[PDB]
Structure formats: structure tokens, C-alpha cells
Amino acid sequence: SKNSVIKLLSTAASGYSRYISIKKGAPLVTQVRYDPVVKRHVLFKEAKKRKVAERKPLDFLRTA
Amino acid sequence: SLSPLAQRVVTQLSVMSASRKQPKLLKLAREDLIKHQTIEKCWSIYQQQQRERRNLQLELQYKSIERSMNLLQELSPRLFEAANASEKGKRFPMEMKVPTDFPPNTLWHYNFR
Amino acid sequence: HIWSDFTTRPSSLSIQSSKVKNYLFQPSISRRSNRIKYSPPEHIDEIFRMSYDFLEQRSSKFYENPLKKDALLIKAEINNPEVQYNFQFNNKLNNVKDIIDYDVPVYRHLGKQHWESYGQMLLMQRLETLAAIPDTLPTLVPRAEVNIKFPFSTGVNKWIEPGEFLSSNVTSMRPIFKIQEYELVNVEKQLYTVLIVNPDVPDLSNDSFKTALCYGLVNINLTYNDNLIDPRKFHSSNIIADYLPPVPEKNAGKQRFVVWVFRQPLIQGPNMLEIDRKELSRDDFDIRQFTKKYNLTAIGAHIWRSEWDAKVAAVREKYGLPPGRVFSRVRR
Amino acid sequence: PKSACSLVKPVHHLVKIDKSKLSPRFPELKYDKSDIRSPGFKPKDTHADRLNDHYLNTLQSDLLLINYSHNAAVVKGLKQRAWSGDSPYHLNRPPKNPRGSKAQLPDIHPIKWSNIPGLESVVINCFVREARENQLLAITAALQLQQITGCKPHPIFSKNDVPTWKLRKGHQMGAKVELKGKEMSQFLSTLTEIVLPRIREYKGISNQSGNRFGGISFGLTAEDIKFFPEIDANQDSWPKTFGMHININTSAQLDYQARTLLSGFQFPFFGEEK
Amino acid sequence: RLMWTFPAYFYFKKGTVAEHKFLSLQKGPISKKNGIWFPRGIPDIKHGRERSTKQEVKLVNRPVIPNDRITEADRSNDMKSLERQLSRTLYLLVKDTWKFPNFDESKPLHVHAENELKLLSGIYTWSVSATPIGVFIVKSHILAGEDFAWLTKGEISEYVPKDYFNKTEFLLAD
Amino acid sequence: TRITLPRRPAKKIQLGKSRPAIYHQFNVKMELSDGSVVIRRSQYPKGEIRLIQDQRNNPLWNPS
Amino acid sequence: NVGIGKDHSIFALEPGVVRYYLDPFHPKRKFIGVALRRDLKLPSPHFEPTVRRFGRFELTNKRAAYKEENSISRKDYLAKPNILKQLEVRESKRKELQDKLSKVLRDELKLDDIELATSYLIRVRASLKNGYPIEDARFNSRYYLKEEERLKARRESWTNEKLSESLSKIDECSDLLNSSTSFNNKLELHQYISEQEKQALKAKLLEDLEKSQHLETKKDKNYIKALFKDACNFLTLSEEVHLRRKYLKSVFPVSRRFDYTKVEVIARSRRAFLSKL
RNA sequence: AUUGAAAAAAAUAAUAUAUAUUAUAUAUAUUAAUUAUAAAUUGAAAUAUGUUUAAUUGAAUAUAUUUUAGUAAUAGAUAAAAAUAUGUACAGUAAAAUUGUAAGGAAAACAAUAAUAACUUUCUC
RNA sequence: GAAAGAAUUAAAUUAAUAUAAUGGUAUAACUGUGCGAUAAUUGUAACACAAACGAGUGAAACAAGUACGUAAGUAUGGCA
RNA sequence: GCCCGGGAGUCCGGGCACCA
Ligand SMILES: [Mg+2]
Ligand SMILES: [Mg+2]
Ligand SMILES: [Mg+2]
Secondary structure (H helix, E strand, O other): OOOEEEEEEEOOOOOOOEEEEEEEOOOOOEEEEOOOOEEEEEEEEEEEOOOOOOOOOOOOOOOO | OOOHHHHHHHHHHHHHOOOOOOOOOOOOOOOHHHHHHHHHHHHHHHHHHHHHHHHHHHHHHHHHHHHHHHHHHHHHHHHHHHHOOOOOOOOOOOOOOOOOOOOOOOOOOOOOO | OOOOOOOOHHHHHOOHHHHHHHHHOOOOOOOOHHHHHHOOOHHHHHHHHHHHHHHHHHHHHHHOHHHHHHHHHHHOOOOHHHHHHHHOOOOOOOOOOOOOOOOOOHHHHHHHHHHHHOHHHHHHHHHHHOOOOOHHOOOOOOOEEEEEOOOOOOOOOOOOOOOOEEOOOOOOOOOOEEEEOOOOOOOOOOOOEEEEEEEEEEEEOOEEEEEEEEEEEEEEEOOOOOOOOOOOHHHOEEEOOOOEEEEEEEOOOEEEEEEEEEEEEOOOOOOOOOOOOOOOOOOOOHHHHHHHHHHOOOEEEEEEOOOOOOOOOHHHHHHHHOOOOOOOOOOO | OOOOOOOOOOOOOOOOHHHHOOOOOEEEEEOOOOOOOOOOOOOOOOOOOOOHHHHHHHHHHHHHHHHOOOOOOOOOOOOOOOOOOOOHOOOOOOOOOOOOOOOOOOOOOOOOOOOOOOEEEEEEOOOOOOHHEEEEHHHHHHHHHHHHOOOOOOOOOOOOOOOOEEOOOOOOOEEEEEEHHHHHHHHHHHHHHHHHHOOOOOOOOOOOOOOOOOOEEEEEOOOOHHOHHHHHHHOOOOOOOOOOEEEEEOOOHHHHHHHHHHHHOOOOOOOOOO | OOOOOOEEEEEOOOOOOOHHHHHHHOOOOOOOOOOOOOOOEOOOEOOOOOOOOOOOOOOOOOOOOOHHHHHHHHHHOOOOOOOOOOOOOOEEEEOOOOEOOOOOOOHHHHHHHHHHHHHOOOEEEEOOOOOOEEOOOOOEOOOOOOOOEOHHHHHHEEEEEEEEHHHHHOOOOO | OOOOOOOOOOOOOOOOOOOOOOOOOOOEEEEOOOOOOOEEEEEOOOOEEOOOOOOOOOOOOOOO | OOOOOOOOOEOOOOOOOOEEEOOOOOOEEEOOOOOOOOOOOOOOOOOOOOOOOHHHHHHHHHHHHHHHHOOHHHHHOEEEEEEEHHHHHHHHHHHHHHHHHHHHHHHOOOOOHHHHHHHHHHHHHHHHOOOHHHHHHHHHHHHHHHHHHHHHHHHHOOOOHHHHHHHHHHHHHHHHHHHHHOOOOOOEEOOOHHHHHHHHHHHOOOOOHHHHHOOOOOHHHHHHHHHOOOOOHHHHHHHHHHHHHOOHHHHHOEEEEEEEEOOOOEOOOOOOOOOOO
């Protein structure tokens, strides 16, 4: 109920995916991991789109 | 955005913060730095000397006191006992002020009570 | 005004550059624009002068057995700004006589302090972590720095950081040591020895390792300023085991080459010692035993480590050695 | 992570090794906090501390004199008691906690030339309680503290939870400042010359306020804070003011000594009988 | 040099008369303009201060004038005066060689001493403690107004025998 | 009901680059009840301050 | 010789005999360890050398050995070709340098063995480029060659006399080079200069500079440049740079600047950059 | 480099430029930046250009151009209030109880509460 | 004789451990902080413990890449 | 998981797959 599964696809287009579980609110996940096809680390990104529990963009530039 | 009180509070906070108020850290030429270091060392040495002086003086005083006590016990026992009487509640004059930077209008008092 | 005088006091205690001295006494930052930009702190002059006067006075007061005398001298000098300037802002490794004399005690002391601050510590760490000490020689107490170099092969210039990996090319020909002594020792009568040992060569009989002595100098004369052990100095009489290079066998781990420096036992002139150059077994070699025999006291050490590579075969060939064994990749 | 098992391998040398120096990571951090090269540098002896001078010249000797008993040796206080070995169970047993209390107590050394009572440090804690509701109050209090002292305070957060009062952990409430050296002396002078006098009905510090190992404490109401110079000059600027506690740590072995020392600096202890 | 900027915006209001007055006393820092050479570095100004350099701030109602720290000097005579060396510790000394007020068994010693000296003038002293010092000497501190003579620690060395000075040198503080 | 100032993302003070708080202060002249002047370093902008109610006039500090 | 897993399970890292012990270094801790052989006790003497196993066997079987020799890390394999290429390039460069040196020698007219001399020169140059006093560098170079010769002799079981002769020849060559030739500021080769001579030259240059510190024309500037053009042969690099900084000041003592008085606009004598630049 | 002030160079490190080597070295030069980051009509400052007055100076005031003011914490390798639960690197100790202190107590916050034998450096008889 | 440093000894302990109970833990696994979001990666896993089988548990080593670390090394999620 | 009814978000009620 809280934790859904998601598929993370290699940004190098070897089509090697890896799966992980996250909370429903969880931010858009990416993680760099080893891709055995390309034989080097690469970024893995969410394949399917999903709504995210929106967080306010914290302001570094002293606004107002 | 914010109430006047809030603004005031913010200002107050800023007064304490180092935000935008602090200057750039002072750099030094090598020679200058060396000179500074030397000066510091000298100062330290002076301080140490002063401490020794004072400490030494204190020690001497203590020794003197001890000697007196030794004499006193030998000589007048009652007197010695009286001298010993522990000062558990002793408290400084209060009229005996702390040194100021510049002296007062009446530079000393004659009449009292 | 003792620091102004230079009769008995060596000339090295002053700043050799005149401009700098002038600046100090009433700058260096080369560029004109930068100089213009610069703004020193106020009231530095008079206060500085006062400080100098104070410290000079102290030095004078200080001024009056050998070690004690040396110590006193050091105490007197240290606070001299000029000496500080010299030490801090000029190179201690490739020392230059007149700028920093290690004949002069103050400078020596400063050097020692510097060593203690960093390099010595680093060396110690390397020894401990890599298991140099307990494995070869029980312990040491630092005493003197020892910096090695491999100038002849390749041709480049670099002081080796302790516990580095050197290519077989680099360590193909012999090294150069600089044993920077401190601690008020005799110079005429005191001799030294230097041993490059590697304790991890594969013993197949026992299945453990055995320690080889790959390079051995004895009865070397040193000087506080002149301490580079080049073929100029030592001569062929001083070599007990002539240099053999690191030639690690394939898959025989990382062989640790640990250079030890010892000082001779002291009894009129320079006391030598014979060491049965032929009899001494170098292929398998007991360091501790050797030390016990000749009563050495290990002052300083340095270390590097070698691994197999394509180049080693060539090196072996050059040196006229066997082709070199090859070991299984598994630690079975 | 596989291990989870802390075990330092023993070494084979007596060289100390200050790891930080072997790392090139924090090159500014390598220097002392008083070496000019460091960004953490600030000057210490900006001018002379008059109060400290007074202590050194006049008071210290007096203190040495007055405290001196004849051949008073250490009356070492109550410690952890070892177990009588009249049974085998005592063998590897931890010792008995002190006869009097749970905590172990220090030895009282005689007042000689080497260890005369002195002022060590002054800690001011202003726990504004109304800050449970309004967090801006805390900030204001901190500012006030800063104004009073001239050295950065540190925030005091609510360490406990309790329903009866509206108190929940993790809530900034008040400010705490540690005063030392010349600054502390200055503060004390300000307290004594200006504030404590000006406060209307003040009969002096209470004589029971001894920490018992030579520490003394006293309060100041929200009204008295107006009497400080940095606040008095602008009453328009300070609508709300906050009361505070003041703790004074001394090199004194016992409370009475400490209070005597304080009296030397013009602190009226007419509050009570010891 | 290292101080923070003076935060005038807190102390003084941005439309006040006092604030205006304050501003009038102050002179600003030379700002930067595109097209000019600043050979002393470019002005790094933030919050109304050049970061590069030290920054200073100019400032019954009455100007506070301090009293002179030298009345003794003016006097140039009164060795029997208390308002003499104000920033120095003084000690009472009496003539006969000449020395500290000696006074020659039912009472406690310090108390007796106090009593003895109280009679010679009519002054107000405070004994530091019953504990004596030296050969039996008591210490005491004055609070009110053969020779009544007052001296510093250095001045006494000239006015007394060497041996005596040696005996009681460590008593006389600076 | 909890009235707060909602914090910004704070500034990272690097290790070694922390500069100690040297607040701007003036060497103020403090005149007491009597003519005794005393110097103290204060953060408020004022050269001179004379005082009406001080320790020197209060009976508790002096029985004269 | 004992490991510890996630459960705090103790396991053997090496073949051997299990022992339980108390270690003095760690009071109030019980230890399990593996002694490498039975006879010896396990809380082993702290300073005595640590008994290691090694425990790899050597590939006698020749094919296997060959295979082992062949096989290397993947990283090495990846970056080997590149490395080789780099090496080749370096070699080429060296060859070129050697050729240049030879040409220079020919121009000079010095006797030469020639190849050896060239090699020596190159070595010296390399040393110079790296941080070495020149004489010392030369010596080092000589020594390298000597060492090589010795090695060769050892390899081929030479008649020592021959070796000696070779050494002598080498020494002679070095002397010839040392006396005849010397590298410069910019690491190019020219005819030799002694120390005193060099000093004299420097002095002369200084004098010239002093004389002609006006520079009131293009011609003058040109002359100055020409004069500078021979400075490398008798001057250190840093010194030369300093000199250049001093005397080819891009401008001499229409813009605008600031001053301590109040802005200050300056037109300038416009013959300060035309001849300068 | 030109402006100020009144022959050169000899560390570490950083930056710029070059080259040496199947060695992350060396040579030359210089020592920058160290809490900043968009968007403000009335806040403040500076400079440039005018007019007036006691060739210039100061002062007043006008216009232009810029600079500041968005005010926001910890300033310490922070250490038992909250917030980050996995890696590594470096560091440090908790809790209770007792004695105290404005409101403040059974129960808010802060402070204090074990031994210096030996050793090193510094200052001193 | 003093100051400072390095400490050392004693007490360590029920505080704290994402979570029950137990065992552990200051040499800290507990806490703080820098960097880092990387070992909460990819092929072979011997050999043990446990075990009817199905399963489970610890895990050396080989190879590929990554993170932190001056280095030694450490990391195949969480003190168990 | 997908589709509705009461730009985004929350809170509720319908369906439509999944149902080995
Ligand atoms: Mg437990
Ligand atoms: Mg963990
Ligand atoms: Mg099974």
C-alpha cells in the first residue's frame, strides 16, 4: 500500500533494467549503478512516469 | 509578506549575524607575518615573566606567613590560636572600590561614619 | 645588540638578501600593482622594534659540556626574526649552506621540529600500516630523516614519498639517500650503514617468505650539510652487497622494499668495521641477527614497494638474472 | 558493511601521529586558532582588563592571606568505596558508590600561593518561557544578550517534553552565553558599577546560593535588564525585555571562599547568613 | 581591521532626525564605476563599507571631561598625602633608621594592633585577617584620612636600610 | 499558533573558513555619580554617557 | 588470521589450527584465532615478525606459466595501446633531439662514439630540465652510462681490460663535451662558457642596460631587443625574465584612473606604446 | 607594465605556462578568492557634469551614471534539543543523582560535581 | 616552583542503538562532523554452520566497474 | 495499477483490469 515497485532503465541504451521499491510520495529516483552490458557505471532512470509528492523548491536567493 | 514586528525581529537577528557585515580576512606579506609572530612571542614571554614574578611573590608571602605561624605557636599559644581562627564569613570592605580609569571629583574621603 | 654582531656567530644567522633585511628593520611581493594594493597593519614598526630589542636582550643574557652548550645556543637564537625567516621561507631538503647551515644548532633544531610536525609522522604511519617494522626490524626511534631518490634510471628528479609504488623502470638502477641527521652527534668519528631489505620474497620450502638484502653500504661518513650518498662519496670498499633491483615475480604480492639506516658503535679517528663481504648471505638475510652481531642502532628508515609489470623481464635480462617464476593467481 | 566490530590493532612505535597533519584536506585548519594565518584568528589582549589587574595586584595576596589556615592538609572528600575482601564474590565486583551520594566528590586542597580563588567564567542563561508560543521572542532575547555582553550567544532549545506547561522538545527558547577572560571581567564591572546598584530594592546576593564547589548564581528580573547601558540608551528599541540567570564559576574549592572572592569585586552578600 | 560593519540600520531609523545627523557626520566609501582604474584594488563594498580596509565611525547634556591622573605630580612635595600616586599601592611608614608602625597580651594580636593605631589619629582601617606575616606583622587597609609618611614600593627602598628592605620586600606590592 | 520565522536554507561554513564574531564596538566614556570616568567597549554608538544612579551614590556600596 | 561476518560469526582466513586466547593488549576481551602451525602459541610475541602463509604455487607447466604472463588487468589492457603510442612518440622526440644535438656538434666542429656522445648530451639536457645543478646532472648522466656498460660487461663475460678502456673512452668524451659545450637558459646547445666568463658577460649586459634605459625611438627599441637576443647563453632563466620585465615595460612612466587627492584623466606622451609595442 | 611609497632570486601550497618519464614529476612566473549568487520608484553611498557662495579649495544644490540596502541564525570538524536510518574519513563521550539560580516548583533552562604519580615544552629561584 | 600540552588511571553502562526481548557495544556498533550519495553495483562463489528434502546462515578468493580515504584500507545495505 | 463522478493538489464514492 505504501511501497510501490518501479523499473529503472539504464541511460546507456543497453536495455538492462533494474528494479527497486519506493514510497508513493518518493522523489523522482535516479541512481548510478553498474551496467553489465556496457560494463561500466551509468545512470539508471525511472521508465514509467509517476506523480510525485511535490516539495517546495527551497530558496537560496533570499526572496522578498 | 511579513508583519512589521516580524521585520523588526529579522533586523534584530541580522544585527547578530555575520551576513554581509564581516570584511575580507587580512592577508600579510611574509616578512610582515614573521614580524607579527615575533611580536606575539615577545608578548607571550613578557606575560610569562609577569606571572612568574607575581607567583614568586605569592609564594614568598606564603612562606613568610608560615614562618610567622611557627614562631607564634612556639611563643604565645593563645595568640597563635586567635590568629588561626578561621575566616569563614570574612567579606571585603565595600568602600574599598575597584580601580577606575580616571579618578573622582573628591580624590579621597576624610570624614566618615 | 648581539644579533647585529657577526664575529663568532656564523654568517647564516642573518638574512642574506639585503632588501628584505632593510624592510624588516624599518617587501617581497614582486608585482608593483599588488604592492600598491597591499596595506600592512598599523603601528607594526615601533612595536616590532621593541619586541626585537626585548628578544635581543634575552639572547644576550642567554649567551655565555657540549650538548648543554648547544642547547643553550639554540635557546638564545630561535627567537631571532632573521633566522626564522631563513628557515621558514627557504628549502630544507636541498639545503644551501649560507641560507640554512645545519652546522648551526638552531637551524638543525628547527629542521627536527619541522620533521616531527609531518614527514616523520608520515614515515611512521607508512612503516606501521605496511608492516615494515615488526616484520623486518622490531622498532625504531626516528632520530634522522632519510629521503631516497632514483636519479640514474629514467633521468627525472623526485624525492620518493614513503610507501609508494615505483615502476620497475624507475627502480632499475640504484638509489640515492639523504640522511638528514639532527641531535648534536659527532661528525668526524661517526660512521653509518644503509641496508635496503625486502622481506617478502616467496619461500617455497617453508611456504612462507624470506628476506633479501638488495643493497648494502657500510662505514659511510656523513656531514650535517653534506649528506647525499652518491657514488662520488662511498667508493667500492663500502658496498657489502651491491645493488640488485626489485624484480617481483608475477602474482607474488606487492614486495615492500624498506631502506634502513644505522649508525656505527663509537669507541680516536673514524672507527671502521670489516663485515666478511663474501660470507654474508644476501639471498636470505637476517636483519635483527646482523644488528646484534655488529651492535648497530637503526636511526632512520624509508620504504617503497614494487609489483610485477611487463618491464621487469627486461630489467632481469639487463641484470643477467633468471627469467623469473610465475605464480598462480589464486591464494590457494 | 560486514564487520560491526571495533578493535584497534596495536602499534610498534612511540611516535604519536596527529593524522590530521598527514591529510591535506583542511589546510586552514592546520594552523592554531591564534596564529594570524588562520581565518579563525581574532586578537585577544585588545586592551587591559582593569578588574583582572585589581585582582592581581590587590586582591590575590589578600585572598592568600585570609584563607591560610596553619597546617591544614587535604580533607579528601567522599569517593567510591572498595569492597572488603571477606568473601569471594567481592573479587571482580565494581566498587560501592560514595557513602553520602550517588556521585563522587572532589578533594579540597588548602589555599596556598599556587591555587588562590579566582574568576574562571561567567555563564548567562535567559530561558524565555513565553517562547513556547512565540519563537521570535527567543531571537529577541538572544539579541538582548548579545547587546549586554558583546559576544555571540548560543540558542537554548527545549530539551524536555511536558504537557502541564506547553513545552515540546526541539523548540528554540532563549539564549546562553559563555563569558571568559577580559570580556567576562568587563561584564562583571558593568553589573557591579551600574546595574546591581540601580535596581530598586536589591539587598544583595543570597548567601545560600553556593554551588558548594565554589560556584555562585543569581537572577535578574525583566525590569532590571533595562538598567544596562546598551538597552538604557534606546528604550524605544526594546519593548519586551527578558529576565536571566547568571552563573559564576570560580577556581575556589568551596562556596564560602568563592563568595569572599566575589565580595572583593564589589558583590553585596547581605542577602543572608551562611 | 577585522571588525564587522557597524549596522546603522538597526540602531538608527531610515527616516529619523538622529539618524540623519549621524549620517551627516559619516563619509561614505568610494564606490566602483565601469570605465575607471582603481589601482588600490577594486572597491569591494557591501552594506556601506569597503571590505578591503578598516572602517571607522564618527560621533544635563554635557561633554564628559576626565579628571587629571596627576595631582601628586602637581603637589611635588606631599609625601604625607593620600591623594598622591593614585594608580599605585601606598604604604604607611614612621620615623624614629625608620620603619613600619611598631606597637608593643590578653587581646588578639591583629585587633590589638588595630586598636593601637586607631588612637594616634582618630582614620578608619580594615584588617584583612587575624593571620600575621613575617617577623609579628599585621596587614590592614585604610579608608579615611616620628612622621606620618606614605610611599610606593620603589620609593621605600631609598628611605630604609637594605637588610630591612630584604626582610620585607615581598610584602610591598606594586 | 506557534509563531515562527520559517528558516531559509542556511549557508555552509566550510571547515577552516569559520571567522569568529568580532562585533563593531566603540570605546565609550562612562561618568559615574561623582567625577570618576571609566572606559568600556560597547556596541551602542555613543562617545560619552553620564550616570545618575550608580554604585558610588547608593548607600549599600558605601557606609560613609 | 580470523575474520568476522555480519552476525559476528568468526571464521578462518587461512588454513591452520584454532586457538582461544587472552591478548594483553586487549584486557577483558576473549580472542579466537588461527595459529598458522600447531607448535607455536597464538597471542604471538608482539615484536617478533608476523608468520605469513604466502601459500601460492608456482606454474611449472610451461604453457600455464605463459598464459599467466599473458593475462593482465582489464584497465591495463584498455590503456596499454595508448601508453605504447605515447612511448613511441616520446622515442621519436628523443631521436629528433639527438639529431639536433648532432647537427649542433657538427656546426661547432668537435671530435667524436658520436651516437654515445649524443645520448650523453640528451641525458644531460633531461637532467637540466629536471631540478639538478648542471655539473651534478652531467655526473649523473655519465654514471648512468657507466652503469649500463658495467651491466653489459656482466652479461657478456667481457675482458675487464676492455671494459676499463670503454669507461676511459666515455670519460674522455664527457670531458670533451664538458669543456667544449654547455646548455642554456632555454635548453638548447651552444659553445661552452666558464663561470667567471659568464659573470663578466652578465656584468657587461647590466652595464649596457644602465647605459640605454631611455628608449626614445623604435630604432632604440630594436637595438635593445637585439641585445637581449644573446642573453640566454650566459644567464639563468629567472634572471632573464626579471631583466625583460624591468626593461621591456610594455608602457613607460588616453585613459582615466583614480588618485588619493580626489578621478584623474591622462592623455600620455603617445610615444610610450608606439615604439614599446 | 603605466599610478603609490622612498640588477634579481633561493620554502610549503595554490593558480598560469611549458616540458620530462611505460614515474600525477620538474622548470619559470604570480601569490587571486575565503560567504558571494537574479528581481527593489520613497533608503543610503560614490563618481562625472552644471549653478551659487566663503585660478583653486571647502560648502550648498541640480542632472546623469553607477554602487550598495532583498537586511535571515551554525562562524564550530559543531559532539546527547530537534532534522538524514545506507558508504567512508576524522573526532568525542553518555545517563542518573546531588548543590545551586528571575518567574521556577515534584516536574521547563543553565552551571557545577574522581585522581595528578610519571613525561614533554615553556617561564622562573 | 608555576603555565600549557600530551595524557594515563579510575569510573565506564544502562544513557544511546529505526523497532520487542536477549546478547553485544567507549577499542564504541553510541553521538558529532567533512566528503559522498557511492557497496541498498555486476559475473563466478570454494568452504563451513545449519539441515530429511524444499529452504536458511556466515563467507575466503577470482574477475568488472564505483565511493571515501595522505595512506593502510574500508564498503556486496542497516550491531546481531 | 487504469478509467469516471463528486491547470494543479488534497479528501470522498463508482467502476475497469489482477484474482496464479
Ligand atoms: Mg542491551
Ligand atoms: Mg552503522
Ligand atoms: Mg541442504
